[PDB]
Every structure is written in C-alpha cells, then in structure tokens.
Ligand binder design. Structure first.
Ligand code: SF4
Ligand code: SF4
Ligand code: SF4
Ligand code: SF4
Ligand code: FES
Ligand code: K
Ligand code: ZN
Lengths: 114, 126, 108, 54, 86, 95, 688, 48, 208
C-alpha cells in the first residue's frame, strides 16, 4: 500500500496547497474581469470559483488532490497571461445550454434517458 | 523513505474529465463475448470486454442517418482477466454487471457409435 | 451501368467497408425480380477525401471516380449525394468514363 | 507489388476469374491483412530530417 | 386495516435458517389449514438471510429478522404478525 | 416508367415518396426533386432471353475484364430461365 | 484414473480414453481447422481438412475421428500438415463459384477465413466449374446449391436433432447433390438452425437476404421471451434497426439452437406498433394525445377507485419490473385483484411453495433421467428445445418416453397410453404396468404441461400427478436429491408473475367485476367488455394493437423485449436479464417508467426512480428474481402433496388435447407472431 | 471525338447540362428509403 | 523464401544481444528485462526509479554514446495496473545504432523528467502530460501543448472516446464561440473486423 507521493506527504500539506491556490484565484478574479471586459460582476466570478472548488470537495486522496492543485495552477497561469480568449473564460458559465430536466416526470416526458 | 501510506480506495473520477451524467447513469457490462454461430472459430472469445449500455439513436431529418448524442456509444475496452476489468471499472466509478464465462462442455465423440448393434445411435445414412 | 441498361452495383458493401472517412452509406433489400440491388447509396462529398479506394475495391466496376472537378456548389447540403444524383452523374459522364476505363484498365 | 496475395491485392483480371484471388480481394478490402504482434521504430531521411514511425 | 400477504424468505443450506426450515416441516400444513385465504409465499435462496415480510392494507410492508431463530421463535413471530393486523 | 404521386411528386425506382402530411417537402418547394428516369428493372426486362445449346453456361457480362466476375449458370429446369446473379441476363436451353 | 499421456507439439497433456486428436489439441489450446466436424453432431469425416500428422508415421490422420493412444506426438504446425491443408482446400475451391460479392455469408464465411489462414494465394484451376440446379425447401431457408461443398451437416442435423429424415445426397461423384429429391418443404421446429451450421452460403436466411453485412452489425446479448424456455440470443442490429437474431451458446438451456419463431418474429416486432398515446374522443374513436393528458385522465379515473373496483390482467410478454410496479400501484389503493391470462390451479398448496409450479429438475435433468412421463402436453410446439433435449437423451442415453394425451408426432417413438385422464388414476393406484415401470426406474421424471391446467379439472390433474410423484418418490429407489414433479410452462411472464404473488387466472375478476381495468399487453381475449360492466375504463399498455387495444379507452405505448433491460424467469426458475438493443419508436417508453410516472401523477408516488431501485424492490419481494443465471432449488414436495389431498376435485371424462396439434398452429400464438408477415407466409406454406 | 466518337448507349444524356447550383434546377438531397416502422392505425368504429 | 520473405540480419542480432547483456550486467539495479526482436531491435525494460541513471549512462559512456533522442512515446494499455508505458528511443551517431528503453507508471505515481539528459524531451514529455496525464516531476514548464485551452481530460487515453464530450459552434446571441455537448449527425459506425480464426501459431498464449 506504500505509494510514491507527488507533493504532499499527508492531507495537511495538500489542503494547505488548496488554500493557497484558492487565495491566488480569489486575488486573480478581478484582473480577469477587467482585462477580458466581461459583462459579469466580480462576485459572480468569485462564486463561480467557489463552486468549482466545492465541486471536487469529496476527494480524500493526497495524490488526486495534488494533481487537481497542479491543474488549477496551470489554469491560473493560462488565465494570468491572456492565452485563454473571452470564449475560454466564459465557458465556465454555460450561457447557451438550456437547463436539463431534473425530476423523474420531466425526464420521462422528454426522452428515454434515466 | 520517500514513500507514504495510502489506505483509501482509488478514485480517478475527478481527473478523467468525464461529465457526471456519463458517470452516475451509465452501467458497464464486463463479459467474454459470445462466439458467432455462423462461424466455427473461437479466437474472438479469448479476452474479456467492457461495453456500455445502448442509448437513443434517431433518424436524421435530412438524409436519414443514425444521429446520436451518446459519446460512449462505440467504447469497447479489452482486458485479459476479470479482475483487471473489475479494477478498471471501480477505479473510474462505473456501476458494472459481470457475466461469467461460458466454457462449452466437452463431449465424448465416437465414430463407432454410428454403427452400433443394439443401440439407437445408428446413422440412417452417411 | 452495364451496356444493357442494368446498373452495375450489386450492393456488396466493399466500398463502404474500405472508405477511410466513412463517406459511403449503403442500404439494400431484394427488389421485385429478386435481384440484389441497393435502396440507399449516399456519398458525403464533404467527408470524401478523393483517394479512389472505392473505385479500386469495386468488383464489378460500378462506382467510379469520374474526371469532372468543376462541380462546386453554393450550399453545403448540395454536396451530399444520394443514389439518384450518382446515377445521373454516371449517365452524364458515361461517354468519358468508359473511354478512361478502356485506357487505364490494363494497368490494374 | 509483392506476389504474396495475402498482403497485396491481386490483379483485377485475376480477381474476376480465379476463386482464391476473389476471396483474397474480399478479405483484403474488407478486413485487411493480419500483422504479427510486436513494436518497431522505422526512420527515414525526409527532406526535413529524420521522419520516424513507432 | 388487516393482513394481505405473508412472505418468508429462507435458505436451504445455511444453518441460520435451520429452525425456520423446521417450522416449514412441522407447523405449516395445519397452519395452511387455519388460513385458507392468506397467501403465504415461501421463497428459498442460495445465500439469503432469514426474513419475514408482512404486508398490510395500502402497501404497508414491515420486516422481521429471523436469523438463528428456533421453531418456537418463528412460530411466535408469525402469531404476532397474524394477530397484530396493524 | 416514373409514376406520379397524387401530390405531384415523382416516385423513384426504390419507391420513395414523401407523404401528403410530411413536412420535409419544404425542401422541394421552389426547387426540383432529382430522380432518374432510366429504371434498371424496366431496361433489364427488355433484354431478350438467349437460347444456348448447353447444359451449363458461363457469364462474365461482356467486355472481359470490364465486366463482373465469371459465373456458371445451370439450365436444367425448363420451366424457368437461368439468370445471371450480377448482370441479370437470362439464358435458356433450347431443347 | 484412466488418463493417458499425449503430446501436442511436444507439450504433454492428459486425456481420457476414446478422446479424438481434435479434442486433445483443443485441450492444449490449438484449434485444428474443420469443415464437416461438429461438437454436437456425429463424426462424419468427409472433408479431410483436419488431416494432422503424427510423428514417426508415414500418413496423415483425420483429427476429427482418430482416437489417440499413449505416446503420440501430434504435429499441428509441421510442413506436410500444411501441404495437406493447402491441397485439400485447393480441391475445395476448385469448383466453388465466384459468388462472394453477391453472398450473404461474405464477412462471416468459414471458407473465406480459413482460405486466408491456411489456404494458398492463387488458383491453378484452368477448367470449367460445375453448376448445381437449385432447390426449394420453404420460404425460410434460401437454397443455392452451387455453393454447397457437400459437408453433410444437413443430413446429420435433420437425422439426429430435428428428427425429420428428409434430407439426403442423391448422386455419385462430382454430380452428387444434397437435397430432398422431390418438391418437399423442410418445415420443422428447428428448420432455421441449418442456416447456423452451414459453413458456406448455400443455405441462407430468406428474410435476412440482401439486407446487411456481418462486419457492420452490433451484437447485443439478450434473452428470448417467445416461450418459457428462456433461450439466450444475440440481436444483431445496424444503426438503430434490428437485423437478425442468432443463438447464444448456453449449455443448460438452448445449447446452440433456437426455434423458428424466435429467429423470425423480429419483422413482426417492427410491424403494427403503438407509438403515441391515444384516448377516446367525443365520438368514441381513438385519437392521438400527449403523455401528460393520457396520464392525467388515467390517474383521475384511478383516484376515484378503491378496493375491488380496480383490477389488472398481465400479458404473456411482461417483465417482472412492470409486474411489481403495477402490483405496488394497485396495492396503494388496496387492490389485490391482480391476475394473469394463463390459468394455474390455486386450490390446495397454490402458489405458496415454489415446488409445484416449477420444472424442478432442470432443462438438463433429462440427461440424468431414464423414464420420462409426459402428461397432457405437446412439447414439440410448446417448448421446442425441451423436446430437443428429450430427443437427445432418447437417442444417446436410451431414455424411455411415454405420453398421455393425443398421439401427436414428437419425432421419436414413445408409448401412447391414451388420452383419458382417468388413466392417471391407474398409476396412482397401481393397476397399470407403467406403475411398475416407474417403480423400477432409478431416476424417473413426470412432466405435466401447462396447457393441461387450462381445463376445468386442472386442480384434479395436478392432484393426481402430485399423488403419482409422491407415491413414486417415497416407495421406489430414488436417492432423495432427485426431483420428480415437473411442470412445463408456455408463457414467459408466468413464473415471474407467480413468484410475485399474482393470482393465476381471471376467475377472481369474473367473481367481482371491476370498474376500471389494467391490461399489460393481455391480448389473449380471456376478458371482453361483455363480461365487464357498462362503463369500464380499460387501459391497455403494450406495443402491438391486436385484441385488447380496440376495446381500450386509453392506450399507453410500451416497450418490447429488444427495447428495454428487463427480467424474465423461464420455466425452471432461472432468472435472466435482457439488454437494450434499439430504442422504442415514437413516444413509447419503458413499462415500469409509465407505471411509476402514473403513480407520481396520481399522488401515490412509488419509492423507486431508477432500474436498480426497482430491482432492489424485486429482491425485497423475492430474492431469486435478482440472481441471474442461477437455478434455485424448490423443496417441500411432501407438504404440497399433503395439502393437495384436501380438495377432492373430480376429473372430467373429456380427453386431454393440446391447443397445438400440427405445424400450422405453431407459428401464430401471441401478438408478436400474429403481426408478422414471415409467420403468415409460413402458415400459408404449410396449409397448402 | 470527330474521328474517334464514343460508344453510344441508350441511357447516356443527349443534352449536356452545366453547373446548376444556385438555380431553381439545383439538386436537393433527400432520403431514398421507405418508412421502417408501420404504426397501428386505430379502427374507425366506436366500441359501443 | 528468397523473393518475398524479408531477409534476416543475424550479425546485428548477435551484436544487439551482446550489448543487451553488457547493459544488463552494468546496471543490475534498474534493468528488469532485455529483449531483441526478430527484426533486430533492442528493448531494455527498466524500473521507473532508474529513468535518470540509465539514460545519462547511455548518453555518456564511451561504449554507448547515444547522443540523440529520436522519439519519446507513451502507450496506454488498460489491462495492467500500471497502464502507462513510457518509451524512449535513442540514436547513437558514433556507433551508428538505435536503442529503446521502456518503463511503466500508473496515473498517480509521477516519474522523473529527463530534461537534464536531453532537452528535446522538454517538449516531448510535456506532450505526454497533454494527452495521457502522466505527471513528469521536476519539469521547467509543464502545461498543455496540443489541445484546447479550456480542454478537460486526456484524449489519447483508451477510455476516452473518439469524439469528445464537447464541441464548438458560433452563437449570435452571446456573439461568441460556445461549447455544447456533442451530437453527431451521423454516428461513427463501429466495425467488427477481427477474424475468428487463429492467425499466428508462434504467438499462441497458453491457456489458463
Ligand atoms: S474516394 Fe472518397 S468515397 Fe471513395 S473510398 Fe476514398 S474517401 Fe471514400
Ligand atoms: S459500388 Fe461496387 S464496391 Fe460498392 S457495394 Fe456496389 S458493387 Fe460493392
Ligand atoms: S460461401 Fe463463402 S466462399 Fe462461397 S461465395 Fe459465399 S462468401 Fe464466397
Ligand atoms: S448446404 Fe451447407 S450445411 Fe448443407 S451439406 Fe452443403 S455445406 Fe453442408
Ligand atoms: S473435420 Fe475431419 S475430415 Fe472434416
Ligand atoms: K450459412
Ligand atoms: Zn453475367
């Protein structure tokens, strides 16, 4: 069961890295709002950041969360410089996809999918 | 020692990039594929396969082609043993159904049985 | 077509099995006189790469790649040829396709 | 072409006459030949340099 | 309101259902002679735990565990089910 | 031999024709439906049956290498004519 | 141990005495090519492809027939073995026609595959080929005898499995033709399976002809629902359209065979379908409407009913999920009047114990029996593969078969005891010699057909057969692990309905007529509107409109067995699950989804949302409905036979006759087959 | 073609047509297959 | 076997076997398997922990001098517990030869980057991070190199489907290129082309 760690020896260093990444993203959001000329508020971007951080909140593996931190740092580097376009940044906000049916009755009405 | 102790189960569900709709609603099937009865070869029934359930395929309004919206429609995975397939299944968080391998029962062939003296296995003709 | 009016294809599906871009769609059923003939033969010209695998995998010289190249359209769906368009193209360019095949059939 | 008809397709005149030629033409233009298992790396001198296929 | 059907799930090999099986071999037929209109479905399974299901009116299903229960215990449980009707 | 549907649409040799209530006929209004007026069944029905004096016959479709693969047709039955699988030409023993 | 040592390519292996070279090479792992050999047919050895070389011996031996001895080394990859294979296949392909592009076997042809594998690369034949005159053997099997290679699997299948003895070889030399010598139709239960075991394209499937190609068809492993045998099948589809149905190899049920109805009911499965929900208008005609409107009308009718005012009749092709969903929905309004079209006698032990309505031994148990007594059944048309297993045991294990009922043709010679049911009373008393025959039998077997329980005295017949079985089992030399009492079912949705606590028979509905009725594809016509009261809200849920749909107020389109993942229990209690091959057409949905949505609309929401939760509910009702491909034993025969003696039902004097006597009545049974054109063509062929 | 004319056939067009794209005589794609599933038409008589 | 069968080179086979024994006996700590193919190619399957001490040896030893890195590759085989197979191809200009070094890793365990050995790998293994997810520890700049900027998932993994989970189209309401779930107008028709008969008896695996 002995494996090779990536960055964190246990959960504490990994969640510290998560905390630092969240601080960096929260500092970075107003700059990406200003430079990309987005039509959204800063609070909307920060709550989207919080939603994306809480999406992966069930991970209890140091290597998986280390890889998640690495990918988050990569995305932060890609959005500090303007390598993402307005489309790439705005793709986190699904503005063109209609909300799918949620309950059983509407899903029964609209198709065969479970 | 440069090694750590990890006791939790494997979970690569958050790293593969698959949306959750194609994770919590899919039902994989792990099975040895059935031999084609029109042929006689048995080389296609050697390796275990992982397949997914069939979703909706409809007809195109213009040309009548088979339009689909299922990204995993043509995903067949090959595994040497059942345990490797089941480990790949639970690694990615897919609910699975496992079918046992159906090895054919050996017979007792006899060419002399076609020419018996007091039995019913006499061939009518040849 | 054969030199009696009968179309050459007998729906063997070699061309759609050898087409690398999957541009050929074939659906067949037995017709009135019990002959193995196609019912749907669709070639997507926007999928086709124009490499001549279908014209060289055809056992009865049915599908051919004619010499015409001035057929650009103004609409996307006009480049989605069904069986009727291909048969009309064959009847339009048979007088050239037969001569080209007679010229080049000894190299195959 | 190579004279191995299980790799290269036969001549079109032989395909319409012989039986084994037609069978090999069918199985080559539907399924394709079977390559023995293994891995290789073949490199040539393309005009841009070493062009390799693994 | 009252009883509608009884379901007994048991096992054929494991000893945990053994006394339950004792019931089916000793105190069933006369029990079936006392309730001619009560469907008592007996289901055997290869590796199931002993179980007793009671269905009342309007789909009220109640569950009773019968693991390592002797003939007297499962008999008393069945009398409680029959005489409860709740 | 192309028949005309009651809506005015033409019917292909396959038999495909859009229904009266089918909306997809909006693709044909202001334009034309491309059909071929040379039906293969009617043209192959005009070919005469060839009388030959052999029990079996060999057919290649004509032209040699420009035709279909060569096949052998048995003509033992006298009630019906043996037909080529590819070309559709029919032969008959004259006896 | 009598295992002896042999060598395959220098590798040592153990074999039993009497083992062929082919089986030993298969045990090592080498598949010797073969054309005429079959593991389920007699050894013929008339193709010479399997010629393998034994070392230190100046001759090649036929591996499909040569019995091995000790010390043999088998060279499966030497030079002269390959030379023999190449010469034999050059001879085989010398006279073969150039029909590959116009052949349905192309892409799945054994001759093409081993020509690529073991054959040569060119043809030295510079002569003229032969041309065989074609034959007609029916509208199912298309015959082109120019492509036949004279492998004689036709003759062995029709002589040892189908038992027809109508196929043979006429001629001598290169002009020998495999046929029937006269205009005779090869009509049988298993007449399609020759298409499975023809290595060339000589025998093809006429409905499937010129439609698809084997390399572009997706194969989905599913379960047949056409009868109660529960045949494992493979549905080959192509872009959302079902093309063909092939057998699956299951050694316990349908080894590699299927009946003709299973193979050829798909074209009727895609005809006369229900696509949208219809409701009655102000003129009493069915007009199309939305799902919400029809479900709201049905829920509004259901809300006003309570107690005995709502009932249900189950069809013959219903899964356990839909059955348990309808049972829960009707239990929410306190209605236990759930019925099935087929009748099973409930007087006595009833459907409480699982011993008295199951084929308790196995399908394969006929391989262990020595005396089999068939009472009031025609197993050739009701369970064709069970009859095939009986014939296999009769031919190989020298089984003794006796029949009570009409003297029908079962393709083997049995002992007809007469059609009088009172003859059964003679076995339970001992005045008949067959009582002594059963007493001296070590592993006896008594099979009672489900069609004999449809009569008025089904309880009396069941009591008599149970008395016979208990007299035999407790007085003869039976071990105690053996199961004698067996019942052969004919409805796929029968055992699963009985395990869920349904009431078999519609006499409970006739006793107290309901105000609204539920039909789960019950097309038998057992209940009509004349028996029902004046204003009956009949709701039909199914896929084909045959009998119950013209009399229905609301039609709810359901899904077929190829369009949903569904649980079916065969006649021996073995649960199996089908898979989704295609999707239901139009607005048709899954049946349990319809019932659960109806409960959701009505304010009586059921506690399951996905298929797995419904399966957990199924396991709650009965566990053996979720253990797939696992036969569960059913004990306590003594208690059922003791309870059966209380009700002294009296046998009628009428003789026992089945509903199917000839080949005409087999093809059109239920709504799937009655809406088929191939079955109609088969009926038209056998009538003339 | 004045000295080497092509072989004449019955099906070859006698009137050549140029590129018809953008004209009312342009090609329009459509499916060339019949309907697969045949629906169940309800009876036109009430159950009364 | 003269005009059709490819000629066999035995001197190169013997030399490569001798050099494989040489490499295996020089480095017994990291070298696990050494094999020579039938067309005279040498494969050295090694431990991942010896990615660096092996390669520099082949870069710096006087008898190897494999100064060129031709190709760096990764192979995804899902049937193993270590599904990723990283393969280095080395070219020696001095001795005019080619060698192949293979190693294994799974999704989570990182492997040491060889940017201190060959700098071309500075891009090459970065490409692997874009398409297989194998994280290369101690890299100067590791990011995506071929896929889209907002792309999620590694496309060259075998469990990743052919078509992606998203597609791009222009929307005039938001005046932007938007990503939507994929809906193919015609499905990619999967063909079953495997022959059911055994082809090569020399590669016949023994049964279980
Ligand atoms: S020429 Fe076009 S249609 Fe023909 S095989 Fe090539 S890509 Fe396909
Ligand atoms: S066009 Fe030629 S290759 Fe294609 S299906 Fe027709 S006969 Fe076969
Ligand atoms: S049976 Fe096989 S070899 Fe013969 S024509 Fe058909 S595909 Fe070709
Ligand atoms: S028709 Fe087919 S199965 Fe019958 S003898 Fe000929 S090759 Fe064998
Ligand atoms: S398989 Fe043995 S001779 Fe045919
Ligand atoms: K066949
Ligand atoms: Zn011809």
């Amino acid at each position: 069961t002995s494996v090779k760690p990536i960055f964190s020896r246990d959960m504490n260093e990994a969640k510290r890295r998560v905390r630092e990444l969240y601080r960096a993203w929260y500092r970075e959001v107003p700059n990406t709002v200003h430079l990309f000329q987005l039509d959204i508020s800063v609070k909307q971007g920060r709550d989207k950041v919080r939603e994306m951080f809480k999406k992966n909140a069930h991970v209890t593996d140091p290597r998986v969360v280390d890889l998640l931190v690495i990918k988050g740092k990569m995305e932060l580097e890609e959005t500090i410089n303007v390598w993402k376009q307005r489309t790439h940044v705005m793709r986190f906000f699904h503005e063109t996809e209609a909300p799918r049916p949620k309950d059983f009755l509407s899903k029964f009405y609209v198709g065969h999918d479970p | 020692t440069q090694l750590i102790t990890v006791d939790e189960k494997l979970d690569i569900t958050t790293l593969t990039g698959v949306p959750e709709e194609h994770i919590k609603t899919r039902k994989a099937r792990i099975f040895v594929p059935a031999r084609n009865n029109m042929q006689s070869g048995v080389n296609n029934t050697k390796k275990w396969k992982m397949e997914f359930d069939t979703r909706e395929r409809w007809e195109n309004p213009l040309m009548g082609w088979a339009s689909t919206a299922d990204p995993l429609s043509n995903l067949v995975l090959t595994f040497s043993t059942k345990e490797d397939a089941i480990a790949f299944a639970e690694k990615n968080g897919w609910s699975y159904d496992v079918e046992e391998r159906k090895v054919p029962k050996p017979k007792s062939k006899s060419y002399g049985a076609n020419f018996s003296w007091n039995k019913r296995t006499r061939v009518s003709t040849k | 077509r054969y030199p009696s009016g009968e179309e050459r294809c007998i729906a063997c599906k070699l061309c759609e099995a050898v087409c690398p871009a999957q541009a050929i769609t074939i659906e067949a059923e037995p017709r009135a006189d019990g002959s193995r003939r196609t019912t749907r033969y669709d070639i997507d010209m926007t999928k086709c790469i124009y490499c001549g695998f279908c014209q060289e995998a055809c056992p009865v010289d049915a599908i051919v790649e004619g010499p015409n190249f001035e057929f650009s359209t103004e609409t996307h769906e006009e480049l989605l040829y069904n069986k009727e368009k291909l048969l009309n193209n064959g009847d339009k360019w048979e007088a050239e396709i037969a001569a080209n095949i007679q010229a080049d059939y000894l190299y195959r | 072409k190579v004279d191995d008809a299980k790799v290269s397709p036969p001549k079109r005149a032989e395909m319409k006459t012989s039986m084994e030629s037609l069978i090999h033409h069918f199985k080559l233009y539907t399924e394709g030949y079977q390559v023995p298992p293994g891995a290789t790396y073949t490199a040539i001198e393309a005009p841009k340099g070493e062009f390799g296929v693994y | 309101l009252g009883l509608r059907e009884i379901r007994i799930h048991l096992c054929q090999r494991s000893p945990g259902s053994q006394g339950v099986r004792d019931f089916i071999e000793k105190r069933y037929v006369e029990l079936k002679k006392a309730n001619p209109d009560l469907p008592i479905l007996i289901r055997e399974c290869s590796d199931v735990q002993p179980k007793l299901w009671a269905r009342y009116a309007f789909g009220q299903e109640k569950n009773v565990s019968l693991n390592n229960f002797s003939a007297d215990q499962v008999t008393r449980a069945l009398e409680n089910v029959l005489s409860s009707k709740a | 031999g192309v028949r005309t549907s009651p809506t005015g649409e033409k019917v292909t040799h396959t038999g495909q024709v859009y229904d009266d209530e089918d909306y997809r006929r909006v693709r044909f209004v202001g334009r034309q439906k491309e059909v071929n007026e040379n039906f293969a069944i009617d043209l192959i029905a005009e070919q005469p049956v060839s009388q030959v004096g052999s029990r079996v016959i060999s057919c290649d479709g004509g032209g040699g290498a420009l035709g279909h693969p060569r096949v052998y047709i048995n003509l033992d039955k006298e009630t019906k004519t043996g037909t080529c699988g590819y070309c559709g030409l029919q032969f008959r023993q004259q006896h | 141990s009598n295992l002896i040592e042999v060598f395959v390519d220098g590798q040592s292996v153990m074999v039993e005495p009497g083992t062929t070279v082919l089986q030993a090479c298969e045990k090592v792992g080498m598949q010797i090519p073969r054309f005429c050999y079959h593991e389920r047919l007699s050894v013929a050895g008339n193709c010479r492809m399997c010629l393998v070389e034994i070392e230190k011996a100046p001759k090649v031996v036929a591996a499909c027939a040569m019995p091995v001895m000790k010390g043999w080394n088998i060279l499966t990859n030497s030079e002269k073995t390959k030379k023999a294979r190449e010469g034999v296949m050059e001879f085989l392909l010398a006279n073969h026609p150039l029909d590959c592009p116009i052949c349905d076997q192309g892409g799945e042809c054994d001759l093409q595959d081993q020509s690529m594998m073991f054959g040569s690369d060119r043809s030295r034949f510079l002569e003229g080929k032969r041309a065989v005159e074609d034959k007609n053997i029916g509208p199912l099997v298309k015959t082109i005898m120019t492509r036949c290679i004279q492998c004689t699997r036709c003759i062995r299948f029709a002589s040892e499995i189908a038992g027809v003895d109508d196929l043979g070889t006429t001629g001598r030399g290169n002009d020998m033709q495999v046929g029937t010598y006269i205009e005779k139709m090869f009509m049988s239960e298993l007449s399609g399976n020759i298409i499975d075991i023809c290595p060339v394209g000589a025998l093809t499937s006429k409905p499937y002809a010129f439609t698809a190609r084997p390399w572009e068809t997706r194969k989905t492993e599913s379960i047949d629902v056409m009868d109660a045998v529960g045949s494992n099948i493979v549905v080959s589809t192509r872009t959302g359209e079902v093309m063909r149905i092939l057998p699956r190899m299951h050694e316990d049920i349908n080894e590699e065979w299927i009946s003709d109805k299973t193979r050829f009911a798909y074209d009727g499965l895609k005809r006369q379908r229900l696509t949208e929900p219809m409701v009655r208008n102000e003129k009493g005609l069915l007009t199309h409407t939305t799902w919400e409107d029809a479900l709201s009308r049905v829920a509004g009718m259901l809300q006003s009913c309570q107690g005995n005012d709502v009932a249900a009749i189950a069809g013959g092709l219903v899964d356990a999920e839909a059955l348990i969903a309808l049972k829960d929905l009707l239990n929410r309004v306190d209605s236990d009047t759930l019925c099935t079209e087929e009748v099973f006698p409930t007087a006595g032990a009833g459907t409480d114990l699982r011993s008295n309505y199951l084929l308790n031994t196995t399908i394969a148990g006929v391989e262990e029996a020595d005396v089999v007594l068939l009472v009031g059944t025609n197993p050739r048309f009701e369970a064709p593969l069970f009859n095939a297993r009986i014939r296999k045991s009769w031919l190989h294990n020298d089984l003794k078969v006796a029949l009570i009922g009409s003297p029908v043709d079962l393709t083997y010679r049995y002992d007809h005891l007469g059609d009088s049911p009172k003859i059964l009373q003679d076995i339970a008393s001992g005045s008949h010699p067959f009582s002594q025959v059963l007493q001296e039998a070590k592993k006896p077997m008594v099979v009672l057909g489900s069609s004999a329980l449809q009569r008025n005295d089904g309880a009396a017949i069941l009591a008599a057969v149970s008395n016979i079985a208990q007299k035999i089992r407790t007085s003869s030399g039976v071990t105690g692990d053996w199961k004698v009492m067996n019942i052969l079912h004919r409805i796929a949705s029968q055992v699963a309905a009985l395990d869920l606590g349904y009431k078999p028979g519609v006499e409970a509905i006739r006793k107290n007529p309901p105000k609204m009725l539920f039909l789960l594809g019950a097309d038998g016509g057992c209940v009509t509107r004349q028996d029902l009261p004046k204003d009956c809200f009949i709701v039909y849920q199914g896929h084909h409109g045959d009998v119950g749909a013209p009399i229905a107020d609301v039609i709810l389109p359901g899904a077929a067995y190829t369009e949903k993942s569904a649980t079916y229990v065969n006649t021996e209690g073995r649960a199996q699950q089908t898979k989704v091959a295609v999707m239901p057409p139009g607005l048709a949905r899954e049946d349990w989804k319809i019932i659960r949505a109806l409960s959701e609309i009505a304010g009586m929401t059921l506690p399951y949302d996905t298929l797995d939760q419904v399966r957990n509910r199924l396991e709650e009702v009965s566990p053996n409905l979720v253990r797939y491909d696992d036969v569960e034993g059913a004990n306590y025969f003594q208690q059922a036979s003791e309870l059966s003696k209380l009700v002294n039902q009296q046998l009628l004097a009428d003789p026992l006759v089945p509903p199917q006597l000839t080949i005409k009545d087999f093809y059109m049974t239920d709504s799937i087959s009655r809406a088929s054109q191939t079955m109609a063509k088969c009926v038209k062929a056998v009538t003339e | 073609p004045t000295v080497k004319p092509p072989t004449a056939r019955k099906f070859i067009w006698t009137n050549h047509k140029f590129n018809l794209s953008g004209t009312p005589q342009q090609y329009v794609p459509y499916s060339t297959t019949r309907k697969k599933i045949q629906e169940w038409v309800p009876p036109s008589t009430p159950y009364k | 076997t003269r005009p059709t069968v490819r000629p066999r080179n035995d001197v190169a086979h013997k030399q490569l076997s001798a050099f494989g024994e040489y490499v295996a006996e020089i480095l017994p700590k990291y070298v696990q398997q050494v094999q020579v193919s039938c067309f005279s190619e040498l494969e050295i399957c090694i431990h991942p922990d010896g990615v660096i001490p092996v390669l520099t040896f082949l870069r710096d030893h006087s008898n190897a001098q494999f100064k060129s890195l031709a190709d760096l590759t990764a192979v995804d085989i899902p049937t193993r517990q270590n599904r990723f197979e990283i393969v280095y191809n080395l070219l020696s200009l001095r001795f005019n030869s080619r060698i192949r070094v293979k190693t294994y890793t799974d999704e989570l365990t990182p492997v040491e980057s060889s940017v201190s050995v060959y700098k071309a790998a500075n891009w090459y293994e970065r490409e692997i991070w874009d398409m297989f997810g194998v994280f290369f520890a101690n890299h100067p700049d590791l990011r995506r190199i071929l896929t889209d900027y907002g792309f999620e998932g590694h496309p060259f993994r075998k469990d990743f489907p052919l078509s992606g989970y998203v597609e791009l189209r222009y929307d005039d309401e938001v005046k932007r290129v938007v990503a939507e779930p994929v809906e193919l107008a015609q499905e990619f028709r999967k063909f079953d082309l495997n022959s059911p008969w055994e082809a090569f008896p020399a590669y016949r695996q023994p049964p279980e």
